[PDB]
């Protein structure tokens, strides 16, 4: 549980685009076709998406070359 | 080492937070009303006539 997301502002500081990074996260991982790179603590895409940017594993750019990788797996 | 009264207080979380982060202060603000409540009510003050 992350009660504060300090860390995770100052990963990528805007306290605005770390909103849509995180709410891109937790759709890949809701909606379907993604897993998550940290362990599941029974909680929430949502904290679980903060604790990914937190750890320094998932942000824009990282997002878009993936998204490009797979893109031409397809 | 003051007496703390409402504005010792107040300058003593602007320096936790100024000088720490945000976590830390945000722990030493609930540890501090935790502490307070307890205390005060174990001394009982009560005003009387």
């Given at each position: 549980a992350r009660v504060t997301v300090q860390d995770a502002v100052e990963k990528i500081g805007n306290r605005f685009d770390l909103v849509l990074v995180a709410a891109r996260r937790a759709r890949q991982m809701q909606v379907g076709g993604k897993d998550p790179l940290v362990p599941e603590?029974?909680?929430?895409t949502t904290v679980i998406a903060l604790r990914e940017i937190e750890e320094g594993l998932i942000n824009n750019q990282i997002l878009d070359v993936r998204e490009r990788q797979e893109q031409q797996e397809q | 080492n003051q007496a703390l009264g409402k504005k010792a207080i107040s300058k003593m979380l602007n320096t936790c937070y100024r000088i720490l982060g945000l976590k830390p202060t945000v722990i030493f603000a609930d540890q501090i009303m935790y502490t307070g409540f307890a205390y005060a009510a174990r001394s009982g003050a009560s005003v009387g006539i």
């Open positions: 603590e029974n909680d929430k | -």
